[PDB]
Design an enzyme around this catalytic site. Sequence first.
Site, PDB file in Angstrom:
ATOM      1  N   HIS C  43      -1.966  -4.274  -6.190  1.00 54.31           N
ATOM      2  CA  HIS C  43      -1.805  -5.308  -5.171  1.00 54.31           C
ATOM      3  C   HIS C  43      -0.654  -5.140  -4.188  1.00 54.31           C
ATOM      4  O   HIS C  43      -0.422  -6.010  -3.351  1.00 54.31           O
ATOM      5  CB  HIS C  43      -1.728  -6.689  -5.818  1.00 54.31           C
ATOM      6  CG  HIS C  43      -0.336  -7.165  -6.056  1.00 54.31           C
ATOM      7  ND1 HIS C  43       0.518  -6.549  -6.944  1.00 54.31           N
ATOM      8  CD2 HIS C  43       0.355  -8.196  -5.517  1.00 54.31           C
ATOM      9  CE1 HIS C  43       1.677  -7.184  -6.944  1.00 54.31           C
ATOM     10  NE2 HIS C  43       1.604  -8.188  -6.087  1.00 54.31           N
ATOM     11  N   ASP C  99      -3.701  -3.303 -12.334  1.00 53.01           N
ATOM     12  CA  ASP C  99      -2.906  -3.354 -11.107  1.00 53.01           C
ATOM     13  C   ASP C  99      -2.240  -2.002 -10.809  1.00 53.01           C
ATOM     14  O   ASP C  99      -1.055  -1.928 -10.467  1.00 53.01           O
ATOM     15  CB  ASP C  99      -1.848  -4.459 -11.256  1.00 53.01           C
ATOM     16  CG  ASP C  99      -1.089  -4.723  -9.977  1.00 53.01           C
ATOM     17  OD1 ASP C  99      -1.519  -4.209  -8.921  1.00 53.01           O
ATOM     18  OD2 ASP C  99      -0.072  -5.452 -10.029  1.00 53.01           O
ATOM     19  N   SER C 197       7.747  -5.011  -7.479  1.00 54.10           N
ATOM     20  CA  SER C 197       6.439  -4.527  -7.874  1.00 54.10           C
ATOM     21  C   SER C 197       6.221  -3.088  -7.444  1.00 54.10           C
ATOM     22  O   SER C 197       6.768  -2.643  -6.436  1.00 54.10           O
ATOM     23  CB  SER C 197       5.363  -5.410  -7.296  1.00 54.10           C
TER      24      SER C 197
END
EC number: 3.4.21.5
Lengths: 409, 32, 248
Positions: C43, C99, C197
């Site tokens: 993402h 992810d 992230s």
Amino acid sequence: VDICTAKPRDIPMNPMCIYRSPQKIPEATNRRVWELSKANSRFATTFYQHLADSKNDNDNIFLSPLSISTAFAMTKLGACNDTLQQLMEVFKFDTISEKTSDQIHFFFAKLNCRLYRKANKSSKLVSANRLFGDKSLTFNETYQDISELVYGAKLQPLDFKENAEQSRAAINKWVSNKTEGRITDVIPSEAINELTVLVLVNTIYFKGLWKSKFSPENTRKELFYKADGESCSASMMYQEGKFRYRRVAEGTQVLELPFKGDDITMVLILPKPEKSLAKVEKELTPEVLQEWLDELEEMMLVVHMPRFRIEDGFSLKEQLQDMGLVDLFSPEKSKLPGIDDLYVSDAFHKAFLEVNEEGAAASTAVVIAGRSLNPNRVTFKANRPFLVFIREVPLNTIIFMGRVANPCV
Amino acid sequence: FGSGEADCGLRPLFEKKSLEDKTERELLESYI
Amino acid sequence: IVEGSDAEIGMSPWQVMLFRKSPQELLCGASLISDRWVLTAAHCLLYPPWDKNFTENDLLVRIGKHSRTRYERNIEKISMLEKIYIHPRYNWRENLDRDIALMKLKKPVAFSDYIHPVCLPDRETAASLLQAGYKGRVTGWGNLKEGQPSVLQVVNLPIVERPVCKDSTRIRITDNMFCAGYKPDEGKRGDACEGDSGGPFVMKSPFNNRWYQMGIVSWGEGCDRDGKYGFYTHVFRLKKWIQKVIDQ
Ligand SMILES: *[C@@H]1O[C@H](CO)[C@@H](O)[C@H](O)[C@H]1NC(C)=O
């Protein structure tokens, strides 16, 4: 008899007089109720306009135009040649359907029937509306019998002639009782004297239960910047999330926070830092607002919004007058046949808005747990006066509306 | 692939220069 | 990174920051698994809700950087991407499951004291190291608290037992993601945050003393909240796929 499940034919509707001067429809909706609403939204804007022109820029406002309309729709039931040509001209009813006009009151009952339903499945809605006159008189009694059905309560006689103290407080006693105590001093003392013959009383209280449960741990104090530039300590709520928002022309922000149900949202107009609310105020049109509610797109926002409560009570009497509506308030040039000499002394409205975090929670709101950065997230920092609109989505009916110009504690 | 699959996991300024970093020990001291 | 501390020079060779071509601005972390393959978080590149759909040439990467904004001449190296590779079954709809995503540099980078790849784990290293209580090492230039740092932040965190993870949140956890964090009863704290992230969760080996990227800074409800933990994609658990894009 049940009004929500009633039919114009099913119950006596005949008023006493009649007037008649010279884009799409929402599913599962009566066309007349629609026409009537679309009306109140037209009346609303304008009435707000003159209203804000009175109240000082820093005085935050909150009122239920619909709550008013329905009420003056009760005098229209008895309002004749000229007095009538006004109510219909001022409250924008002068454009509606024929059957709708003659039964305007009815439909307001069917309209509210619908609103108080959508507004209560989730949040706390509650209002007390009633008409008052002196016992030193006798009323239509057909009218005082329709009110029983189309307006919840038959007109009420109170000694205004000889005395007017136990009365101007027998009301403030009633409203209190009815509105679970949330509404008091509906009618200021020394306003309903011996000469006050007829008075309209319409209160209301609304505490929306958000659809995104505002979570307390994130609420904190911040500075609020009033009109006169001065700062101010306010209790500021906050949350990240997906809300329908738009950055329309003139760079003012339009945000819509819905309540649990989606049948009722709350639109917030946050003007640019420079463009004073006053501007957007003295420049509102049911088309501009309908345009804003049009361009709204789902977005990711960081929302900052003050937690506040508003108590707005006042006389509509003065305000209405200057928009037309002159006869109903005059003893000389009046015309209340639908009910001897009779006019309206003063009409009172008292709205009560309560704003604060969840008083429901999401589960598939992981959308903000993602830990990448987000350059598209837009912040809506409401810490400058902004407008408020509480509405019913399918019909875009304007139940409430106001201005938050001073939410600080 | 690329190149260095053989050399990976060895810091030029640590593992290769016979050096351990500030908190490094703390990790190894946890597999017990 | 929340409650971390300034990383040392060359302490995380593989640390790679992922920018956006233009209007050019940081937006994730990534590791370097070979002179031409950068491993990042799904993402970071693709998330429909924030309506983020980046691609090969909407972004670039800055490798072997220690500070954050100052340009480190002769030390750092910019590079574009020849191709992105999001996982095929990346269930971004329910729970950012799978992810993972790697990107192939357009031109092979040059290793130095500041640039170096962090070994991918293997069934043994995974079994051997991916255990509750064992500590890993998260690294990034993300927000310091639920503003931004000045140099690569670094924090070490213990791994949490499946249940506890699953119980800290209302979301449906997956076997393709583990969670690292201190409990409220371990006193000490820290955790990855916003912009971290894509970052690497590494673990040194007590045997061959190498660094293994076990997971990738994925999601987490807030940052460093007591009773809540960060969640990292399980790199190894997705090696099969990782492998079968590089081999072709
Ligand atoms: C809906 O309204 C009725 C009376 O107006 C009351 O019994 C009920 O509590 C309301 N529901 C709420 C506030 O959720």
